[PDB]
mmCIF file of C-alpha atoms in Angstrom:
data_model
loop_
_atom_site.group_PDB
_atom_site.id
_atom_site.type_symbol
_atom_site.label_atom_id
_atom_site.label_comp_id
_atom_site.label_asym_id
_atom_site.label_seq_id
_atom_site.Cartn_x
_atom_site.Cartn_y
_atom_site.Cartn_z
ATOM 1 C CA UNK X 1 -89.156 -31.161 68.819
ATOM 2 C CA UNK X 2 -92.427 -30.360 67.105
ATOM 3 C CA UNK X 3 -94.169 -27.009 67.421
ATOM 4 C CA UNK X 4 -96.621 -27.023 70.362
ATOM 5 C CA UNK X 5 -99.259 -24.306 70.816
ATOM 6 C CA UNK X 6 -100.533 -23.171 74.218
ATOM 7 C CA UNK X 7 -102.721 -20.366 75.465
ATOM 8 C CA UNK X 8 -101.486 -19.006 78.836
ATOM 9 C CA UNK X 9 -102.765 -16.476 81.364
ATOM 10 C CA UNK X 10 -100.397 -15.022 83.946
ATOM 11 C CA UNK X 11 -101.234 -12.622 86.786
ATOM 12 C CA UNK X 12 -98.606 -9.890 86.427
ATOM 13 C CA UNK X 13 -100.621 -7.334 88.377
ATOM 14 C CA UNK X 14 -98.014 -6.895 91.144
ATOM 15 C CA UNK X 15 -95.624 -3.962 90.691
ATOM 16 C CA UNK X 16 -92.746 -5.237 92.825
ATOM 17 C CA UNK X 17 -91.938 -8.457 90.965
ATOM 18 C CA UNK X 18 -91.868 -10.151 87.568
ATOM 19 C CA UNK X 19 -93.456 -13.466 86.584
ATOM 20 C CA UNK X 20 -90.892 -15.679 84.806
ATOM 21 C CA UNK X 21 -92.032 -18.179 82.191
ATOM 22 C CA UNK X 22 -90.461 -21.208 80.427
ATOM 23 C CA UNK X 23 -91.435 -21.876 76.826
ATOM 24 C CA UNK X 24 -90.498 -25.542 76.965
ATOM 25 C CA UNK X 25 -92.252 -26.221 80.288
ATOM 26 C CA UNK X 26 -95.278 -24.053 79.485
ATOM 27 C CA UNK X 27 -95.186 -22.874 83.076
ATOM 28 C CA UNK X 28 -94.204 -20.065 85.358
ATOM 29 C CA UNK X 29 -90.887 -20.880 87.017
ATOM 30 C CA UNK X 30 -89.229 -19.559 90.147
ATOM 31 C CA UNK X 31 -86.241 -17.277 89.501
ATOM 32 C CA UNK X 32 -83.975 -15.765 92.173
ATOM 33 C CA UNK X 33 -81.060 -14.416 90.018
ATOM 34 C CA UNK X 34 -82.645 -13.593 86.689
ATOM 35 C CA UNK X 35 -79.488 -12.194 85.073
ATOM 36 C CA UNK X 36 -77.660 -15.506 85.602
ATOM 37 C CA UNK X 37 -80.362 -18.117 84.990
ATOM 38 C CA UNK X 38 -81.127 -19.908 81.729
ATOM 39 C CA UNK X 39 -84.346 -21.574 83.024
ATOM 40 C CA UNK X 40 -86.644 -18.697 81.967
ATOM 41 C CA UNK X 41 -87.463 -17.379 78.479
ATOM 42 C CA UNK X 42 -89.917 -14.508 79.011
ATOM 43 C CA UNK X 43 -90.964 -12.447 81.990
ATOM 44 C CA UNK X 44 -94.010 -10.276 82.573
ATOM 45 C CA UNK X 45 -94.611 -7.284 84.861
ATOM 46 C CA UNK X 46 -97.743 -5.203 84.384
ATOM 47 C CA UNK X 47 -97.635 -4.507 80.581
ATOM 48 C CA UNK X 48 -93.813 -4.906 80.423
ATOM 49 C CA UNK X 49 -92.101 -7.905 78.827
ATOM 50 C CA UNK X 50 -88.502 -9.051 79.454
ATOM 51 C CA UNK X 51 -86.389 -11.637 77.589
ATOM 52 C CA UNK X 52 -83.286 -13.577 78.499
ATOM 53 C CA UNK X 53 -80.726 -11.448 76.690
ATOM 54 C CA UNK X 54 -79.175 -8.002 76.600
ATOM 55 C CA UNK X 55 -79.651 -5.990 79.764
ATOM 56 C CA UNK X 56 -82.010 -8.577 81.238
ATOM 57 C CA UNK X 57 -80.001 -11.801 81.079
ATOM 58 C CA UNK X 58 -77.130 -13.897 79.812
ATOM 59 C CA UNK X 59 -79.138 -16.036 77.414
ATOM 60 C CA UNK X 60 -79.528 -16.168 73.662
ATOM 61 C CA UNK X 61 -82.913 -14.404 73.695
ATOM 62 C CA UNK X 62 -84.385 -11.569 71.665
ATOM 63 C CA UNK X 63 -87.372 -10.625 69.557
ATOM 64 C CA UNK X 64 -88.605 -9.518 66.178
ATOM 65 C CA UNK X 65 -91.948 -8.289 64.857
ATOM 66 C CA UNK X 66 -93.202 -10.453 61.983
ATOM 67 C CA UNK X 67 -95.344 -7.724 60.450
ATOM 68 C CA UNK X 68 -98.435 -9.854 60.948
ATOM 69 C CA UNK X 69 -101.413 -9.519 63.252
ATOM 70 C CA UNK X 70 -102.671 -13.120 62.717
ATOM 71 C CA UNK X 71 -100.590 -16.011 64.006
ATOM 72 C CA UNK X 72 -101.686 -18.154 61.039
ATOM 73 C CA UNK X 73 -100.057 -15.634 58.615
ATOM 74 C CA UNK X 74 -96.620 -15.637 60.319
ATOM 75 C CA UNK X 75 -95.279 -18.711 58.574
ATOM 76 C CA UNK X 76 -91.687 -17.733 57.642
ATOM 77 C CA UNK X 77 -89.441 -17.572 60.702
ATOM 78 C CA UNK X 78 -86.476 -15.176 60.542
ATOM 79 C CA UNK X 79 -83.086 -16.651 61.314
ATOM 80 C CA UNK X 80 -81.296 -13.490 62.411
ATOM 81 C CA UNK X 81 -81.682 -10.069 63.962
ATOM 82 C CA UNK X 82 -83.412 -10.821 67.285
ATOM 83 C CA UNK X 83 -83.202 -7.510 69.113
ATOM 84 C CA UNK X 84 -82.055 -7.772 72.712
ATOM 85 C CA UNK X 85 -83.310 -6.130 75.888
ATOM 86 C CA UNK X 86 -82.381 -2.560 76.798
ATOM 87 C CA UNK X 87 -82.719 -0.528 79.980
ATOM 88 C CA UNK X 88 -85.873 1.405 80.683
ATOM 89 C CA UNK X 89 -88.250 2.679 83.339
ATOM 90 C CA UNK X 90 -90.151 0.038 85.318
ATOM 91 C CA UNK X 91 -92.736 0.909 87.965
ATOM 92 C CA UNK X 92 -91.873 -1.077 91.084
ATOM 93 C CA UNK X 93 -94.316 0.426 93.619
ATOM 94 C CA UNK X 94 -97.703 1.968 93.019
ATOM 95 C CA UNK X 95 -100.156 3.182 95.645
ATOM 96 C CA UNK X 96 -103.317 4.729 94.352
ATOM 97 C CA UNK X 97 -106.694 5.989 95.462
ATOM 98 C CA UNK X 98 -109.333 8.496 94.408
ATOM 99 C CA UNK X 99 -107.249 11.482 95.584
ATOM 100 C CA UNK X 100 -103.799 10.614 94.278
ATOM 101 C CA UNK X 101 -101.028 8.141 93.693
ATOM 102 C CA UNK X 102 -97.467 7.577 94.713
ATOM 103 C CA UNK X 103 -95.087 5.565 92.655
ATOM 104 C CA UNK X 104 -91.499 4.420 92.501
ATOM 105 C CA UNK X 105 -89.528 3.291 89.513
ATOM 106 C CA UNK X 106 -86.263 1.538 88.719
ATOM 107 C CA UNK X 107 -84.243 1.337 85.486
ATOM 108 C CA UNK X 108 -84.239 -2.348 84.478
ATOM 109 C CA UNK X 109 -83.927 -4.457 81.362
ATOM 110 C CA UNK X 110 -86.913 -5.103 79.134
ATOM 111 C CA UNK X 111 -87.832 -5.882 75.555
ATOM 112 C CA UNK X 112 -88.773 -2.764 73.614
ATOM 113 C CA UNK X 113 -89.765 -4.944 70.673
ATOM 114 C CA UNK X 114 -92.577 -6.599 72.653
ATOM 115 C CA UNK X 115 -93.296 -3.956 75.297
ATOM 116 C CA UNK X 116 -93.031 -1.018 72.937
ATOM 117 C CA UNK X 117 -90.778 2.006 73.305
ATOM 118 C CA UNK X 118 -91.453 4.075 76.411
ATOM 119 C CA UNK X 119 -91.900 7.776 76.849
ATOM 120 C CA UNK X 120 -90.406 9.613 79.902
ATOM 121 C CA UNK X 121 -93.221 8.325 82.161
ATOM 122 C CA UNK X 122 -92.934 4.698 80.979
ATOM 123 C CA UNK X 123 -95.993 4.466 78.717
ATOM 124 C CA UNK X 124 -95.191 2.416 75.635
ATOM 125 C CA UNK X 125 -95.974 2.205 71.917
ATOM 126 C CA UNK X 126 -95.137 -0.194 69.083
ATOM 127 C CA UNK X 127 -95.413 -3.485 70.957
ATOM 128 C CA UNK X 128 -98.284 -5.628 72.152
ATOM 129 C CA UNK X 129 -100.528 -2.989 73.767
ATOM 130 C CA UNK X 130 -101.427 0.545 72.512
ATOM 131 C CA UNK X 131 -103.448 3.569 73.542
ATOM 132 C CA UNK X 132 -106.692 3.736 71.508
ATOM 133 C CA UNK X 133 -108.983 6.742 71.090
ATOM 134 C CA UNK X 134 -112.722 7.036 70.886
ATOM 135 C CA UNK X 135 -115.586 9.226 72.181
ATOM 136 C CA UNK X 136 -116.009 7.239 75.426
ATOM 137 C CA UNK X 137 -112.391 8.006 76.485
ATOM 138 C CA UNK X 138 -109.020 6.372 75.708
ATOM 139 C CA UNK X 139 -108.622 2.637 76.168
ATOM 140 C CA UNK X 140 -105.858 0.113 75.696
ATOM 141 C CA UNK X 141 -106.099 -1.901 72.481
ATOM 142 C CA UNK X 142 -104.340 -5.114 71.731
ATOM 143 C CA UNK X 143 -102.116 -4.458 68.729
ATOM 144 C CA UNK X 144 -102.234 -8.199 67.932
ATOM 145 C CA UNK X 145 -98.699 -7.928 66.631
ATOM 146 C CA UNK X 146 -97.197 -11.369 66.140
ATOM 147 C CA UNK X 147 -93.608 -11.694 67.460
ATOM 148 C CA UNK X 148 -90.902 -14.288 66.992
ATOM 149 C CA UNK X 149 -89.054 -14.628 70.283
ATOM 150 C CA UNK X 150 -85.836 -16.514 71.033
ATOM 151 C CA UNK X 151 -85.751 -18.147 74.419
ATOM 152 C CA UNK X 152 -82.696 -18.497 76.625
ATOM 153 C CA UNK X 153 -81.325 -21.384 74.540
ATOM 154 C CA UNK X 154 -82.120 -19.609 71.256
ATOM 155 C CA UNK X 155 -85.075 -21.708 70.159
ATOM 156 C CA UNK X 156 -87.861 -19.571 68.790
ATOM 157 C CA UNK X 157 -91.486 -19.079 69.863
ATOM 158 C CA UNK X 158 -94.171 -17.431 67.828
ATOM 159 C CA UNK X 159 -96.014 -15.206 70.357
ATOM 160 C CA UNK X 160 -99.200 -13.097 70.271
ATOM 161 C CA UNK X 161 -100.648 -11.241 73.286
ATOM 162 C CA UNK X 162 -104.383 -11.203 73.372
ATOM 163 C CA UNK X 163 -105.525 -9.697 76.676
ATOM 164 C CA UNK X 164 -104.266 -7.352 79.391
ATOM 165 C CA UNK X 165 -107.004 -7.789 82.008
ATOM 166 C CA UNK X 166 -109.151 -10.614 83.395
ATOM 167 C CA UNK X 167 -112.935 -10.946 83.049
ATOM 168 C CA UNK X 168 -113.489 -8.662 86.073
ATOM 169 C CA UNK X 169 -111.246 -6.054 84.428
ATOM 170 C CA UNK X 170 -108.365 -6.606 86.851
ATOM 171 C CA UNK X 171 -105.458 -5.032 85.002
ATOM 172 C CA UNK X 172 -102.106 -6.727 84.447
ATOM 173 C CA UNK X 173 -103.549 -10.234 84.031
ATOM 174 C CA UNK X 174 -101.932 -11.152 80.761
ATOM 175 C CA UNK X 175 -103.063 -13.692 78.162
ATOM 176 C CA UNK X 176 -100.979 -14.828 75.223
ATOM 177 C CA UNK X 177 -100.748 -17.767 72.839
ATOM 178 C CA UNK X 178 -97.400 -19.130 71.747
ATOM 179 C CA UNK X 179 -96.202 -21.832 69.389
ATOM 180 C CA UNK X 180 -92.813 -23.318 70.198
ATOM 181 C CA UNK X 181 -90.314 -24.251 68.909
ATOM 182 C CA UNK X 182 -90.670 -22.896 65.362
ATOM 183 C CA UNK X 183 -88.136 -22.534 62.505
ATOM 184 C CA UNK I 1 -118.938 43.928 67.947
ATOM 185 C CA UNK I 2 -117.035 42.609 64.963
ATOM 186 C CA UNK I 3 -115.196 39.304 65.044
ATOM 187 C CA UNK I 4 -111.596 39.823 66.235
ATOM 188 C CA UNK I 5 -108.928 37.147 65.884
ATOM 189 C CA UNK I 6 -106.034 36.696 68.319
ATOM 190 C CA UNK I 7 -103.366 34.091 68.827
ATOM 191 C CA UNK I 8 -102.641 33.552 72.531
ATOM 192 C CA UNK I 9 -100.069 31.610 74.537
ATOM 193 C CA UNK I 10 -100.725 30.918 78.224
ATOM 194 C CA UNK I 11 -98.441 29.142 80.668
ATOM 195 C CA UNK I 12 -100.764 26.595 82.303
ATOM 196 C CA UNK I 13 -97.856 24.424 83.475
ATOM 197 C CA UNK I 14 -98.651 24.772 87.209
ATOM 198 C CA UNK I 15 -100.760 21.969 88.632
ATOM 199 C CA UNK I 16 -102.226 23.871 91.611
ATOM 200 C CA UNK I 17 -104.097 26.614 89.723
ATOM 201 C CA UNK I 18 -106.020 27.480 86.573
ATOM 202 C CA UNK I 19 -105.332 30.356 84.177
ATOM 203 C CA UNK I 20 -108.549 32.270 83.578
ATOM 204 C CA UNK I 21 -109.094 34.074 80.278
ATOM 205 C CA UNK I 22 -111.493 36.704 78.984
ATOM 206 C CA UNK I 23 -112.517 36.572 75.360
ATOM 207 C CA UNK I 24 -113.580 40.225 75.138
ATOM 208 C CA UNK I 25 -110.521 41.567 76.956
ATOM 209 C CA UNK I 26 -108.079 39.190 75.208
ATOM 210 C CA UNK I 27 -106.222 38.723 78.445
ATOM 211 C CA UNK I 28 -105.758 36.555 81.487
ATOM 212 C CA UNK I 29 -107.916 37.772 84.377
ATOM 213 C CA UNK I 30 -107.537 37.189 88.102
ATOM 214 C CA UNK I 31 -110.202 34.921 89.623
ATOM 215 C CA UNK I 32 -110.826 33.468 93.095
ATOM 216 C CA UNK I 33 -114.532 32.519 93.333
ATOM 217 C CA UNK I 34 -114.678 31.108 89.827
ATOM 218 C CA UNK I 35 -118.149 29.618 90.293
ATOM 219 C CA UNK I 36 -119.550 33.103 91.000
ATOM 220 C CA UNK I 37 -117.571 35.321 88.585
ATOM 221 C CA UNK I 38 -118.756 36.282 85.065
ATOM 222 C CA UNK I 39 -115.440 37.966 84.170
ATOM 223 C CA UNK I 40 -113.852 34.827 82.739
ATOM 224 C CA UNK I 41 -114.807 32.746 79.706
ATOM 225 C CA UNK I 42 -112.266 29.952 79.474
ATOM 226 C CA UNK I 43 -109.702 28.541 81.882
ATOM 227 C CA UNK I 44 -106.658 26.388 81.268
ATOM 228 C CA UNK I 45 -104.840 23.938 83.560
ATOM 229 C CA UNK I 46 -102.218 21.581 82.074
ATOM 230 C CA UNK I 47 -104.219 20.103 79.120
ATOM 231 C CA UNK I 48 -107.577 20.727 80.766
ATOM 232 C CA UNK I 49 -110.081 23.374 79.642
ATOM 233 C CA UNK I 50 -112.920 24.807 81.781
ATOM 234 C CA UNK I 51 -115.864 27.022 80.723
ATOM 235 C CA UNK I 52 -118.167 29.284 82.698
ATOM 236 C CA UNK I 53 -121.142 26.959 82.898
ATOM 237 C CA UNK I 54 -122.303 23.674 84.381
ATOM 238 C CA UNK I 55 -120.150 22.343 87.172
ATOM 239 C CA UNK I 56 -117.564 25.105 86.624
ATOM 240 C CA UNK I 57 -119.588 28.347 86.793
ATOM 241 C CA UNK I 58 -122.867 30.217 86.790
ATOM 242 C CA UNK I 59 -122.393 31.690 83.334
ATOM 243 C CA UNK I 60 -124.006 30.983 79.963
ATOM 244 C CA UNK I 61 -121.027 29.109 78.595
ATOM 245 C CA UNK I 62 -120.533 25.791 76.859
ATOM 246 C CA UNK I 63 -119.006 24.191 73.796
ATOM 247 C CA UNK I 64 -119.553 22.336 70.581
ATOM 248 C CA UNK I 65 -117.264 20.640 68.078
ATOM 249 C CA UNK I 66 -117.741 22.055 64.559
ATOM 250 C CA UNK I 67 -116.521 18.930 62.797
ATOM 251 C CA UNK I 68 -113.720 20.964 61.179
ATOM 252 C CA UNK I 69 -109.948 20.925 61.658
ATOM 253 C CA UNK I 70 -109.377 24.244 59.814
ATOM 254 C CA UNK I 71 -110.692 27.479 61.326
ATOM 255 C CA UNK I 72 -111.403 28.867 57.859
ATOM 256 C CA UNK I 73 -113.849 25.961 57.189
ATOM 257 C CA UNK I 74 -115.972 26.557 60.330
ATOM 258 C CA UNK I 75 -118.182 29.257 58.877
ATOM 259 C CA UNK I 76 -121.675 28.324 60.130
ATOM 260 C CA UNK I 77 -122.079 28.956 63.851
ATOM 261 C CA UNK I 78 -124.570 26.787 65.773
ATOM 262 C CA UNK I 79 -127.202 28.627 67.756
ATOM 263 C CA UNK I 80 -128.004 25.864 70.279
ATOM 264 C CA UNK I 81 -126.655 22.790 72.089
ATOM 265 C CA UNK I 82 -123.567 24.149 73.830
ATOM 266 C CA UNK I 83 -122.618 21.354 76.180
ATOM 267 C CA UNK I 84 -121.783 22.422 79.701
ATOM 268 C CA UNK I 85 -118.966 21.473 82.058
ATOM 269 C CA UNK I 86 -119.117 18.255 84.089
ATOM 270 C CA UNK I 87 -117.062 16.909 86.971
ATOM 271 C CA UNK I 88 -113.832 14.974 86.346
ATOM 272 C CA UNK I 89 -110.393 14.300 87.688
ATOM 273 C CA UNK I 90 -107.936 17.218 87.750
ATOM 274 C CA UNK I 91 -104.296 16.784 88.798
ATOM 275 C CA UNK I 92 -103.629 19.474 91.397
ATOM 276 C CA UNK I 93 -100.110 18.534 92.610
ATOM 277 C CA UNK I 94 -97.172 16.733 91.203
ATOM 278 C CA UNK I 95 -94.034 16.243 93.320
ATOM 279 C CA UNK I 96 -90.976 14.516 91.921
ATOM 280 C CA UNK I 97 -88.573 12.583 94.069
ATOM 281 C CA UNK I 98 -85.249 11.016 92.984
ATOM 282 C CA UNK I 99 -86.837 7.638 91.996
ATOM 283 C CA UNK I 100 -90.562 8.305 91.880
ATOM 284 C CA UNK I 101 -93.290 10.869 92.337
ATOM 285 C CA UNK I 102 -96.562 11.707 94.027
ATOM 286 C CA UNK I 103 -99.675 13.164 92.426
ATOM 287 C CA UNK I 104 -102.821 14.538 93.978
ATOM 288 C CA UNK I 105 -106.187 14.786 92.300
ATOM 289 C CA UNK I 106 -109.445 16.661 92.866
ATOM 290 C CA UNK I 107 -112.840 16.274 91.177
ATOM 291 C CA UNK I 108 -113.609 19.620 89.535
ATOM 292 C CA UNK I 109 -115.618 21.032 86.665
ATOM 293 C CA UNK I 110 -114.181 20.979 83.145
ATOM 294 C CA UNK I 111 -115.279 20.894 79.544
ATOM 295 C CA UNK I 112 -115.221 17.373 78.140
ATOM 296 C CA UNK I 113 -116.016 18.778 74.696
ATOM 297 C CA UNK I 114 -112.703 20.681 74.567
ATOM 298 C CA UNK I 115 -110.562 18.672 77.002
ATOM 299 C CA UNK I 116 -111.837 15.299 75.859
ATOM 300 C CA UNK I 117 -113.545 12.627 77.999
ATOM 301 C CA UNK I 118 -111.197 11.158 80.600
ATOM 302 C CA UNK I 119 -110.672 7.465 81.384
ATOM 303 C CA UNK I 120 -109.913 6.102 84.851
ATOM 304 C CA UNK I 121 -106.195 6.901 84.421
ATOM 305 C CA UNK I 122 -106.985 10.511 83.519
ATOM 306 C CA UNK I 123 -106.130 10.322 79.790
ATOM 307 C CA UNK I 124 -108.532 12.355 77.640
ATOM 308 C CA UNK I 125 -110.008 11.585 74.218
ATOM 309 C CA UNK I 126 -112.008 13.531 71.677
ATOM 310 C CA UNK I 127 -110.883 17.066 72.495
ATOM 311 C CA UNK I 128 -107.950 19.234 71.514
ATOM 312 C CA UNK I 129 -105.055 16.907 72.475
ATOM 313 C CA UNK I 130 -104.714 13.073 72.480
ATOM 314 C CA UNK I 131 -101.989 10.829 73.960
ATOM 315 C CA UNK I 132 -101.308 8.584 71.039
ATOM 316 C CA UNK I 133 -99.199 5.842 69.433
ATOM 317 C CA UNK I 134 -95.942 6.527 67.656
ATOM 318 C CA UNK I 135 -92.782 4.611 66.619
ATOM 319 C CA UNK I 136 -90.519 6.610 69.047
ATOM 320 C CA UNK I 137 -92.903 6.081 72.006
ATOM 321 C CA UNK I 138 -96.366 7.589 72.660
ATOM 322 C CA UNK I 139 -96.786 11.337 72.472
ATOM 323 C CA UNK I 140 -99.452 13.995 72.754
ATOM 324 C CA UNK I 141 -100.758 15.038 69.343
ATOM 325 C CA UNK I 142 -102.867 18.054 68.360
ATOM 326 C CA UNK I 143 -106.264 17.074 67.009
ATOM 327 C CA UNK I 144 -106.784 20.509 65.436
ATOM 328 C CA UNK I 145 -110.479 20.226 66.228
ATOM 329 C CA UNK I 146 -112.265 23.596 65.847
ATOM 330 C CA UNK I 147 -114.743 24.423 68.611
ATOM 331 C CA UNK I 148 -117.413 27.011 69.070
ATOM 332 C CA UNK I 149 -117.410 28.188 72.649
ATOM 333 C CA UNK I 150 -119.917 30.350 74.502
ATOM 334 C CA UNK I 151 -118.382 32.746 77.008
ATOM 335 C CA UNK I 152 -119.907 33.700 80.330
ATOM 336 C CA UNK I 153 -122.339 36.148 78.665
ATOM 337 C CA UNK I 154 -123.233 33.640 75.921
ATOM 338 C CA UNK I 155 -121.317 35.318 73.058
ATOM 339 C CA UNK I 156 -119.478 32.730 70.957
ATOM 340 C CA UNK I 157 -115.780 32.317 70.101
ATOM 341 C CA UNK I 158 -114.373 30.042 67.401
ATOM 342 C CA UNK I 159 -111.389 28.311 69.047
ATOM 343 C CA UNK I 160 -108.573 26.060 67.886
ATOM 344 C CA UNK I 161 -105.685 24.887 70.083
ATOM 345 C CA UNK I 162 -102.418 24.553 68.219
ATOM 346 C CA UNK I 163 -99.675 23.778 70.745
ATOM 347 C CA UNK I 164 -99.210 22.201 74.170
ATOM 348 C CA UNK I 165 -95.574 22.958 74.939
ATOM 349 C CA UNK I 166 -93.148 25.821 74.393
ATOM 350 C CA UNK I 167 -90.040 25.717 72.118
ATOM 351 C CA UNK I 168 -87.939 24.232 74.962
ATOM 352 C CA UNK I 169 -90.544 21.447 75.318
ATOM 353 C CA UNK I 170 -91.881 22.822 78.604
ATOM 354 C CA UNK I 171 -95.234 21.056 78.896
ATOM 355 C CA UNK I 172 -98.521 22.844 79.601
ATOM 356 C CA UNK I 173 -97.662 26.045 77.724
ATOM 357 C CA UNK I 174 -100.812 26.322 75.614
ATOM 358 C CA UNK I 175 -101.251 28.146 72.326
ATOM 359 C CA UNK I 176 -104.648 28.763 70.751
ATOM 360 C CA UNK I 177 -106.237 31.104 68.255
ATOM 361 C CA UNK I 178 -109.754 32.410 68.720
ATOM 362 C CA UNK I 179 -112.131 34.582 66.747
ATOM 363 C CA UNK I 180 -114.770 36.398 68.809
ATOM 364 C CA UNK I 181 -117.605 37.193 68.820
ATOM 365 C CA UNK I 182 -119.000 35.083 65.996
ATOM 366 C CA UNK I 183 -122.555 34.307 64.860
#
């Protein structure tokens, strides 16, 4: 199989569910027992990313950071050391308005490599999306970190996330480009 | 009056109230009608800072950033341009439950110069404290920015905030040093 590149946007704005994605199909797929299903490679929920490995599934998944922020510079693919998913805090319900919010969370599996490591309130650093500071107030910045990501069957995608909101600034609409399979 | 320097720690961990402080007295003072009370100069709430001016009070207060991060470098005191408090989102209740929480907000006066400008999720930038990237997860970091701050009567303090939590990591326990009055 030759390396195919696709740019994908997925609406992961809902808090209650994840959007499951197949590298080989290039499509969102329906998943009803994610921990025992090899038909998905990566899942998205808000700014969280899950892989089919570790605490999130029974597959051969995992992820590394290439050290690059340009996909065209990440040309050597590692053969080992694809860190697997761990448990962390996921927001599963969020009600908000001008006067307050109420939220609920669950401990679930996710990829710290891609998501970043979370603080006690679930905000993350070191992955695809970072807090950024400037005089107009803090924003999210795309880190542009380029990941290598094993899918459920172990074949590797090169993945870079490039947006976290749509053109109307609806948050949790995620865009990424991936090239798959690579070796 | 000669310039006096004091290091102060105030427990501003409660969400429901502000801690009001007098520069001249070097002490916390009790305040109810804060918008009509010249006996306070600076108030603390969590990581928020309020001055007796603008949307927060009828006084002659306000603030500037000196451009310095060392108090001993901020030796020329501006005579004009002390920005006054504006309205923004203040968290006035936080209630934890076993698997989630609830927060309530109010729009109140605060100093953007010292607090930082807030985004739509309430994170501030450009003031004394910034929620920021790190390899173990995101954390608040001290900017060490040195401010000049007019009190209610217009007399100026040099102020630098140097901690946001106590030794047990209790959040919202604020340490600052100030020198007052300066000209």
